[model samples]
Target chain A: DAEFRHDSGYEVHHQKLVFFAEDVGSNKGAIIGLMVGGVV
Target chain B: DAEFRHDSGYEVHHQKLVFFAEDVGSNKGAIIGLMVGGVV
Candidate 1:
């Protein structure tokens, strides 16, 4: 599972969509994934 | 745009995938979006 630090970010992993976010000046963060298809 | 509070979460928005996250003890949060396709 890849990871990144941002208040808002997104990337495609093997056709799957992954997104993440975090508030400014906060240690908390969040992430989610969705299956779309295989990479072209 | 919809909103939810969670340490980690994901959902489908109009066929696109949306994900968000927040650290446990953090006041800040993050979010991201991706274009996949239309809802089936």
Candidate 2:
């Protein structure tokens, strides 16, 4: 797993991917992780 | 941006993040993109 390093040294980590294995969610349902930069 | 590679030759990439700029969605509403692996 890798991360995106912001200009302010804030490293965005702990990335993960998820997919629905059953009908609880949806057949085409998926998940992703990401972060955003802000004012410092 | 970075991505997670599976045990196969498939490369998962194209990551992005989204946040509501206004009340169009929700205060904590966000969107993520991801892919899934399958039997080869």
Instruction: Report chain B TM per candidate.
Output: 0.20, 0.19
Q: What lDDT, from 0 to 1, does candidate 1 have? A: 0.36
lDDT of 2: 0.30
lDDT of 1 by residue, B1-40 (tens): 4454333233323344455544234353434244243111
True-contact fraction in model 1 equals: 0.21
Top candidate by lDDT: 1
TM-scores, each model vs. reference: 0.19, 0.15
lDDT of 2 at B16: 45
- Candidate 2 backbone collisions, by pair: none
- Per-residue C-alpha lDDT of model 1 across residues A1-40, encoded as one tens digit per residue: 4454333233322244456644334354443344232111
C-alpha DockQ of every model: 0.11, 0.07
Could you tell me which 10 consecutive residues in candidate 2 chain B have the lowest summed lDDT?
B20-29
For candidate 2, the per-residue lDDT at B35 reads 27
TM-score of chain A of each: 0.20, 0.19
